[PDB]
Design a protein around this motif. Structure first.
Motif, PDB file in Angstrom:
ATOM      1  N   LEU A  99      27.707 -34.135  23.600  1.00 29.12           N
ATOM      2  CA  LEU A  99      28.307 -33.619  22.356  1.00 29.12           C
ATOM      3  C   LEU A  99      29.715 -33.028  22.596  1.00 29.12           C
ATOM      4  O   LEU A  99      30.667 -33.404  21.942  1.00 29.12           O
ATOM      5  CB  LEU A  99      27.386 -32.592  21.684  1.00 29.12           C
ATOM      6  CG  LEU A  99      26.067 -33.141  21.116  1.00 29.12           C
ATOM      7  CD1 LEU A  99      25.262 -32.029  20.464  1.00 29.12           C
ATOM      8  CD2 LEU A  99      26.323 -34.255  20.111  1.00 29.12           C
ATOM      9  N   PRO A 105      35.529 -30.016  20.693  1.00 27.98           N
ATOM     10  CA  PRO A 105      35.809 -28.781  19.995  1.00 27.98           C
ATOM     11  C   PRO A 105      36.701 -27.892  20.844  1.00 27.98           C
ATOM     12  O   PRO A 105      37.433 -27.045  20.342  1.00 27.98           O
ATOM     13  CB  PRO A 105      34.431 -28.145  19.837  1.00 27.98           C
ATOM     14  CG  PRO A 105      33.598 -28.748  20.901  1.00 27.98           C
ATOM     15  CD  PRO A 105      34.113 -30.140  21.052  1.00 27.98           C
ATOM     16  N   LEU A 114      33.876 -18.547  24.670  1.00 23.78           N
ATOM     17  CA  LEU A 114      32.545 -19.155  24.575  1.00 23.78           C
ATOM     18  C   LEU A 114      31.483 -18.064  24.651  1.00 23.78           C
ATOM     19  O   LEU A 114      30.710 -17.965  25.602  1.00 23.78           O
ATOM     20  CB  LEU A 114      32.343 -20.205  25.660  1.00 23.78           C
ATOM     21  CG  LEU A 114      33.477 -21.230  25.791  1.00 23.78           C
ATOM     22  CD1 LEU A 114      33.107 -22.257  26.848  1.00 23.78           C
ATOM     23  CD2 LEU A 114      33.795 -21.917  24.471  1.00 23.78           C
ATOM     24  N   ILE A 147      26.974 -24.849  23.178  1.00 21.73           N
ATOM     25  CA  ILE A 147      26.831 -25.692  21.965  1.00 21.73           C
ATOM     26  C   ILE A 147      26.112 -24.994  20.801  1.00 21.73           C
ATOM     27  O   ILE A 147      26.262 -25.381  19.650  1.00 21.73           O
ATOM     28  CB  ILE A 147      26.134 -27.050  22.291  1.00 21.73           C
ATOM     29  CG1 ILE A 147      26.740 -28.179  21.460  1.00 21.73           C
ATOM     30  CG2 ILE A 147      24.629 -26.985  22.055  1.00 21.73           C
ATOM     31  CD1 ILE A 147      28.202 -28.436  21.761  1.00 21.73           C
ATOM     32  N   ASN A 150      29.018 -19.898  18.893  1.00 20.29           N
ATOM     33  CA  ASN A 150      30.341 -20.102  18.293  1.00 20.29           C
ATOM     34  C   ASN A 150      31.312 -20.551  19.391  1.00 20.29           C
ATOM     35  O   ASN A 150      31.175 -20.159  20.549  1.00 20.29           O
ATOM     36  CB  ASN A 150      30.853 -18.845  17.609  1.00 20.29           C
ATOM     37  CG  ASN A 150      30.010 -18.445  16.416  1.00 20.29           C
ATOM     38  OD1 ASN A 150      29.145 -19.198  15.956  1.00 20.29           O
ATOM     39  ND2 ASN A 150      30.258 -17.247  15.907  1.00 20.29           N
ATOM     40  N   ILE A 151      32.235 -21.424  19.018  1.00 18.92           N
ATOM     41  CA  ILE A 151      33.353 -21.821  19.882  1.00 18.92           C
ATOM     42  C   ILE A 151      34.670 -21.376  19.246  1.00 18.92           C
ATOM     43  O   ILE A 151      35.084 -21.918  18.240  1.00 18.92           O
ATOM     44  CB  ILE A 151      33.410 -23.326  20.116  1.00 18.92           C
ATOM     45  CG1 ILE A 151      32.068 -23.838  20.603  1.00 18.92           C
ATOM     46  CG2 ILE A 151      34.451 -23.624  21.161  1.00 18.92           C
ATOM     47  CD1 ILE A 151      32.137 -25.227  21.189  1.00 18.92           C
ATOM     48  N   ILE A 152      35.282 -20.369  19.848  1.00 16.69           N
ATOM     49  CA  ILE A 152      36.598 -19.869  19.445  1.00 16.69           C
ATOM     50  C   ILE A 152      37.631 -20.570  20.309  1.00 16.69           C
ATOM     51  O   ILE A 152      37.586 -20.456  21.531  1.00 16.69           O
ATOM     52  CB  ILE A 152      36.735 -18.367  19.716  1.00 16.69           C
ATOM     53  CG1 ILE A 152      35.786 -17.562  18.846  1.00 16.69           C
ATOM     54  CG2 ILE A 152      38.157 -17.913  19.463  1.00 16.69           C
ATOM     55  CD1 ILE A 152      35.515 -16.176  19.391  1.00 16.69           C
ATOM     56  N   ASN A 153      38.543 -21.277  19.670  1.00 20.35           N
ATOM     57  CA  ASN A 153      39.552 -22.060  20.374  1.00 20.35           C
ATOM     58  C   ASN A 153      40.933 -21.495  20.048  1.00 20.35           C
ATOM     59  O   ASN A 153      41.436 -21.675  18.953  1.00 20.35           O
ATOM     60  CB  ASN A 153      39.448 -23.531  19.979  1.00 20.35           C
ATOM     61  CG  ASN A 153      40.230 -24.446  20.896  1.00 20.35           C
ATOM     62  OD1 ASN A 153      41.391 -24.174  21.227  1.00 20.35           O
ATOM     63  ND2 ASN A 153      39.611 -25.539  21.288  1.00 20.35           N
ATOM     64  N   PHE A 154      41.538 -20.838  21.028  1.00 20.40           N
ATOM     65  CA  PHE A 154      42.882 -20.234  20.863  1.00 20.40           C
ATOM     66  C   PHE A 154      44.050 -21.244  20.748  1.00 20.40           C
ATOM     67  O   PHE A 154      45.081 -20.925  20.182  1.00 20.40           O
ATOM     68  CB  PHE A 154      43.159 -19.231  21.986  1.00 20.40           C
ATOM     69  CG  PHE A 154      42.358 -17.965  21.876  1.00 20.40           C
ATOM     70  CD1 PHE A 154      41.119 -17.860  22.468  1.00 20.40           C
ATOM     71  CD2 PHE A 154      42.846 -16.872  21.173  1.00 20.40           C
ATOM     72  CE1 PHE A 154      40.384 -16.688  22.363  1.00 20.40           C
ATOM     73  CE2 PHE A 154      42.118 -15.696  21.073  1.00 20.40           C
ATOM     74  CZ  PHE A 154      40.879 -15.607  21.662  1.00 20.40           C
ATOM     75  N   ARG A 156      44.047 -25.023  19.946  1.00 19.47           N
ATOM     76  CA  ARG A 156      44.052 -26.322  19.193  1.00 19.47           C
ATOM     77  C   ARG A 156      45.051 -26.268  18.022  1.00 19.47           C
ATOM     78  O   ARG A 156      45.679 -27.259  17.677  1.00 19.47           O
ATOM     79  CB  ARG A 156      42.638 -26.773  18.733  1.00 19.47           C
ATOM     80  CG  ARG A 156      42.382 -28.316  18.801  1.00 19.47           C
ATOM     81  CD  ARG A 156      40.898 -28.737  18.697  1.00 19.47           C
ATOM     82  NE  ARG A 156      40.443 -28.914  17.299  1.00 19.47           N
ATOM     83  CZ  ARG A 156      39.222 -28.624  16.813  1.00 19.47           C
ATOM     84  NH1 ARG A 156      38.260 -28.117  17.591  1.00 19.47           N
ATOM     85  NH2 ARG A 156      38.952 -28.836  15.513  1.00 19.47           N
TER      86      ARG A 156
END
Lengths: 256, 256, 256, 256, 256, 256, 256
Positions: A99, A105, A114, A147, A150-154, A156
């Motif tokens: 995934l 993501p 993460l 998975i 929550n996935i916090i992406n600084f 993207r």
């Protein structure tokens, strides 16, 4: 001992079965990979056919040596079950793996949080993902955990936003503060002028009037823009006569 | 009592069965170990064939003493189930064990944080891992717990990063602070000069202007570099006339 | 009523079955104990054969009184299931028991922290472990809980490490502080001189310069060494003119 | 309607079955109680035979009215399952009950902490335990919850230990403090002199030097010994000239 | 179409079955209620016979229209399963309901704390219990939750205990404090004199000597006794010259 | 190809089966609704008959095209299972829905706290309930979550209770405070005089004597009564000479 | 080898079966989509028929090569089970997906709090939802997590409500404060006058009298209204002579 010929036949079935199984399964995930599906999903779905076909082979092969058929389903059932338990955590992590790689993501090189821990992603592998904390620690997080959290992406998003909170003394000119701050950010080139540019009196505070400034910049600039704008506020505010107050206290004396 | 010959035949099947089982299983994980697989995975997968073959033997052996076949699958099913429960935690830990040794997210001798507790790893065993806390306590963590939690590894990365936060008085020269700090770290040989070297005004604080210094060093030096660079800041700052402020307070008197 | 002979035959099977079961099982854990295995594991594995054999006996015995065989597997299945639930917690604890005694992550007499609570271990029994808190409370922890949580063992390691944190006034001589502390620990015989002996300026603090001292001693001495080295630091520091500061505060007066 | 005789036969089987079941089960836990086992485990194990035998009776009885046998195993299976769920919590509590009474980790009258709540135990019953909080609240805790949590027992141990922490001013004579405290505890008869008697300088504190005194007494005395020894320390320390300090503060004036 | 007579027979079985089921079940919980058991347990246990008997009826009735028997066990199995899930929470709550009403760990009108929330109980119903918070909020708690948590009951015990903690100034006469407090409680009639009457110096405090007074009263009086005894302490202490201290602070001046 | 007539017969069974199923199920929840039961329970219970009957139809219909019967139970079993999982959360929420509408522990328009969040209820739907926070945020809470948590209902009760805590200076007349407070509440018409009217000295405080006033009012008035009674206390207390104290501090000077 | 014709027949059944399956399933979700149902639910429900029909095909096809039928149900059962586990999380998330899009508790573009994290929603996809935090971080939340947690939606409601808390000095005119605040909000056009307009003395505070002002505005205006009304209060209050107090303290001097 002409009923000891079945022992030889049993072997024959196993060898032919092992081969017939090995060659179908190979010839299935040849097909899957040639479509597109996904290298891992192929191998997995494939390896089920493989272990399935040799499951049939074992039933019929033992069956010619009088192993009651419905005892093989039972024993193998248990065997599989015992494996199943021992693995699982793995299986679950293996799936999250797919995934993550097939939805990106986060991709390798993005800075992400993460679930409490945050670092720059290095590599997503079979069961576990590796990130490097800003300071050099390495963290290994299980794909499964990642998975379902929550996935916090600084990283993207290409443009991000600093928020300064500056506290000045109560007797400071409200209009003057706004103008100096506004004129600092107006002149900073790295601040995107076509987006939010909020300078405002935000909180009547404990011992300070609190102004909020919020300004957007490219993701790369965000860190340096903050520092540079701050050094600036401090300098200008001093030279302009605005006081960053120390904590206050009205004391009411009583001789006793 | 010519139907008491089946009792003798029952035994024959069990002895032959126990041997035939013991020699196939041995002869299977002879094969596996000779490929590469993994000593433990071999023994395990093997020991399933073993207990499987003697499960068949028990069915057919009891079966010649009129034990209804589908009652053996049932009784052994229950027996296995009762074992299964009692073990499990173990099985789960046993599997984590393998994974840990065959992925080395930490190796013996690395300092690591395994979910709240941190110590230098000593040895990963069957069910449980042993680490030694910096101060000499021994911790025993279950392999299962370890594998389903984050693994923070302080030591696998060769170069790491100190962060100093130094607070100076508000009336201190911004440029002077930066220069002294920059000149301390410039001269320290153990600080890697080809990497980040951030000296900057970071926080307008309660009673102090707060400067952030961040500098990279080899993993071995990190601890000593911090201490040495600190002693330094303190000394230079004093001799140069920069004040580390005590907590401040503006008091506003009122006779009553 | 010549079909009321089966009632008599039913009993015969049960008595013979109960005995045949009792003597196999005894004769199995005779074998296991003579190898090595483990007293409890033997009794358990054994008692499964026992209850298994009388399970077969009940099937065939009731079966001669026309009890449909596949109804006995079912009823006994349920019976077993109902027991199974009622016990379990126990079974799980029983197993942890074994593991704890046959791995000795703590042994009787060691001081340990078993997930929040800590005390001197007294005895590990069937389901539950007993420890005595330093102050005299008794705690009873379930074996199951213990085995799936971290085990912190204060006592298995022979040499351990005190850490002092001493705060002195900002205007104290850095070199003088280091020397006095170093000369205190140098002279203390109970401090292991061939291991870590860290005396260093560690934290620029709120109202104090904070020195960290870390020194290793035998596990027995650790407590007394701490107390003795402290009394010492306090005495020497006073006689030598170094001030342990009270909390500080710069107050900035304003008549109103 | 000569096949409406089976209806009558069905009843006969049920009545004979109910009685044959009631008399076996009675006659089993007659046996168990006469050994020793335990009143509840008897009734329980017994009541399984009971409900088992009438389960067989229902199968054969309905079976003579053409109720397909393998539909009775199914319907009763479901019925049992639905009951099973509804009860369980109970079953689990019932089991904890036994364990608690037959291991007496606490007995009626002991003061205990059963996972956050603590009180004097009154009575352990079928599903739930009753304690009385020192102040008169009654708490009812489920047996199940109790058994799978830590059990802290204040009362099973006959001798227990007070710890005083006394703070005195920094300019107090270290030797003088130790002597007075030592001479207080020396003279108190209720303090067990053959056990720990620690009087020592323990913490260099915020605004106080902190001495730790630890002394053992009979469990009954512990409370009164504390109070009496405290009143004492306060009195002696005052008459002897030692000051319990108020919170301190060095203030550093600045006219502005 | 002489095999379209089975359709008619199928109906016959259903109607006869529905009735025969309805009148057995009624005639079972006629029996149960006449013993004692419990109205709800009756209705429940009964309604299982009911749904069981019509389960048999459906099997045989569909069976005469060639519905394979072992497909009815399966379909109904699923149907039951789907219901089972949808209900459960309910079933669990229903069961707690019974337990609560048939053990009265709290009865209607008692004030209780049911895991964080506390109020006066109004009524325990099928699935949910209703209490009224001292201030007039209504809380509805699920019977299930209640039963598996602690039950704190403020009201079942007839006599309860106030604890006052009174802080006085350090230079207050220890003996004088004790006497005034003791003479206040001695004279209060609502304080049970045959129980605990503790007046004692309890804590050497931050800025106050802290005395603890603990006295028992009828449950009804407890609230008024507290308030009345407090007003009293305050009055007497003032008239007698004992000072309740404000927070203290030794300040140590420094001109700079 | 005269065995290709079964294909045609298979379809016939499906069409007749689909219709026969659709018309029984309709004709069942015609019956249920006409009793009373509940629209949803009807539709649900009904839709089980529906899907059940077409389950039988599929078994017999495929069965005439040689689909082994016990393979249909299996495949449909799996199919159902896969659906079952994917829904469930829904099913659980659907059921909570019913319960909530058919017990009205809150009704539309009541202000309630549903486990941490609180708002005015708008509408309870299939799976989820909608409330509006006092300030205008909308919250959507799953029916399932709601039903298994506490339900605090601010509005169902018609009369509720304010509690004021007023702090006055230590040297304030106890009797005077009580009288003014009592005379404020005595005169307020919206305060229900036939209920609790507690004015009392409650806490000897840090820097204030704390009085508690508790008075009951209609639910509507509660908010305005609080505000009005407060403004009042403040006004009267000022005009009457009672002081709401600022935080206190005894400072004990020391020249150094 | 005329029994090697079954091998060829086995293939025939598979190809015919695969096609017959592929064309029914297509031809089912043609039907579903033409009604309305929902593109995803169609594909899913459809793909079950598909995999079901090829499950039958595999049973009968292998069955002509003597694969015991009840071994295929078993092997495929296991296969399915192993897939089932590996997916699930997905399946659960897939279902939440549907629900979210087909109930729009939030729609793309609304600002929402999805259990601790809050951002502007971008897009709900198969397994995971994407939002953008006010400051530019991207968060990826699993659909499953979202659906079983509270959904706070800031944006669906068209009118919302600011709450100011303003603290003024105790000696400020209560009436004057109310009038200025009331006259500020009266004149602000963006404040909805036909709704709540609360200006009131709310809290007798530590060092301030605290007024609460609550006023409603369109959702768009809410932020700017707050800031503008605040700047205003501060300005007016100053020009009108009302003091926002600093923290207070009565100090009570003592020469020592």
């Amino acid at each position: 001992l002409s009923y000891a010929v079945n022992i030889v036949a049993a072997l024959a079935i196993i060898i032919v079965g092992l081969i017939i199984a090995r060659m179908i399964s190979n010839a299935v995930n040849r097909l899957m990979i040639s479509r597109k599906i996904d290298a891992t999903v192929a191998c997995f779905l494939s390896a089920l056919v493989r272990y399935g076909i040799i499951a049939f082979t074992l039933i019929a092969a033992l069956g010619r040596v009088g192993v009651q058929t419905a005892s093989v389903i039972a024993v193998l059932g248990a065997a599989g079950l015992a494996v199943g338990l021992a693995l699982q955590g793995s299986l679950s992590n293996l799936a999250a793996g797919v995934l993550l790689v097939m939805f990106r993501p986060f991709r390798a090189g993005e800075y992400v949080d993460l679930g409490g821990v945050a670092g720059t992603v290095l590599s997503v592998q079979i069961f576990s993902t590796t990130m490097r904390t800003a300071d050099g620690k390495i963290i290994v997080i299980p794909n499964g955990k990642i998975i379902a959290g929550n996935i916090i992406n600084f990283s993207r998003e290409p443009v991000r936003r600093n928020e300064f909170i500056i506290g000045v003394a109560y007797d400071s000119d409200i209009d003057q503060v706004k103008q100096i701050l506004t004129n600092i950010i107006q002149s900073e080139d790295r601040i995107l002028k076509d987006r939010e540019m909020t300078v405002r009196l935000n909180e009547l505070g404990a011992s300070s009037i609190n102004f909020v400034v919020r300004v957007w910049s490219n993701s790369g600039d965000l860190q340096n823009v903050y520092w540079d704008v701050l050094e600036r506020i401090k300098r200008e505010f001093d030279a302009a006569g605005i006081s960053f107050p120390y904590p206050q206290m009205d004391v009411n004396f009583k001789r006793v």
